[PDB]
Symmetry: C3
Amino acid sequence: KQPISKLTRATPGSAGLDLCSTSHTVLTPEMGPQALSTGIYGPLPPNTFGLILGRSSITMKGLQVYPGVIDNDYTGEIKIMAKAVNNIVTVSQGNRIAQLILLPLIETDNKVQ
Amino acid sequence: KQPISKLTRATPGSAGLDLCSTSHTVLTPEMGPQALSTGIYGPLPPNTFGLILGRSSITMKGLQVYPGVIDNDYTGEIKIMAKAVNNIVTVSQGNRIAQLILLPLIETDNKVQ
Amino acid sequence: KQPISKLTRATPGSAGLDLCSTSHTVLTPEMGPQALSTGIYGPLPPNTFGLILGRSSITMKGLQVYPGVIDNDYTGEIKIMAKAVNNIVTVSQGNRIAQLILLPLIETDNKVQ
Ligand SMILES: O=c1ccn([C@H]2C[C@H](O)[C@@H](COP(=O)(O)NP(=O)(O)OP(=O)(O)O)O2)c(=O)[nH]1
Ligand SMILES: O=c1ccn([C@H]2C[C@H](O)[C@@H](COP(=O)(O)NP(=O)(O)OP(=O)(O)O)O2)c(=O)[nH]1
Ligand SMILES: O=c1ccn([C@H]2C[C@H](O)[C@@H](COP(=O)(O)NP(=O)(O)OP(=O)(O)O)O2)c(=O)[nH]1
Ligand SMILES: [Mg+2]
Ligand SMILES: [Mg+2]
Ligand SMILES: [Mg+2]
């Protein structure tokens, strides 16, 4: 397992930490949502949670990443939920296919139930 | 009407407050976006706004929630904008179908026009 | 080029800064993702990044905006990545078709590589 501290940012001012596919995968529109492996695991830094979002160059190529929430205390593998929009999409091993955004986790008194 | 203070978090470290459907609803891909009732209303805590996002177990089952912005001063009912991706999806009353994330509302000098 | 300081908020408590299409554009579902021009450019205020999200009245009319990340130091034109969901969608010049949300940019020690 690899922690999110192993992820890289494309540039200093990049909001997102890039997530790469660990598998070669072909996706077609009739397959609907697929969960792609990253080999990266939570959890996240204190007082933060994560959002997985598409990379724009990838979205424009017809692979939709559904926005996903990563909980602060998730310790499982971060997966990318993805769907081929219109056409056949081929993901290669190591391709940067999404990005992780870190956001402040606001405390509230909502019941934890 | 029920305020967002009535929502619950799945776990202490869960970023999202779960939103449940108040109706049994069937959705098909040809129907396109539908707005599901929650019986939960704004507004939000001071200096925050909301994002409605999908729950991953729900997205993976073929129901797409379109990300939606909840304004700090919205006092209407929070609705979930949803679409069946490929297949027929049946939502039952009380099913947790999305989640509300709270985020800091940044002040800017943009004209309010 | 116009900076994001030229954007307007619908109301004082609106989280989003509205983005308008500068072109008349027709979109069909078979066209897949299209990048709509706004004539608005980064960069963003210090310590912030942006998210482009749909407006709910627009999403409900069948035009999906794919959530997009605007980096703090992006100096290019902000484009809206959009797709007609089920039907033919006609965007007119000046129509508010998405919104820009500003969010705090969290610093981490991830390699910038
Ligand atoms: O894109 C995603 C979304 C979620 N996840 C993981 C991390 C997150 O903390 C965990 C739970 O996410 P959600 O709350 O969105 N899913 P759901 O509500 O279906 O499961 P749970 O009841 O555990 O909260 O799933 C991913 O790996 N990728
Ligand atoms: O998923 C959503 C998105 C928005 N909303 C409500 C809350 C939000 O404050 C209100 C307005 O949202 P948008 O600005 O996204 N919609 P639009 O720009 O079409 O309407 P307005 O001109 O009032 O801002 O709609 C929901 O209930 N669910
Ligand atoms: O909806 C969007 C998304 C991104 N963008 C622009 C701004 C953002 O800073 C820039 C890069 O975005 P991403 O990182 O999402 N794209 P990608 O990873 O494909 O390109 P790069 O390798 O440059 O980061 O693209 C838009 O104009 N609209
Ligand atoms: Mg990028
Ligand atoms: Mg959950
Ligand atoms: Mg609006």
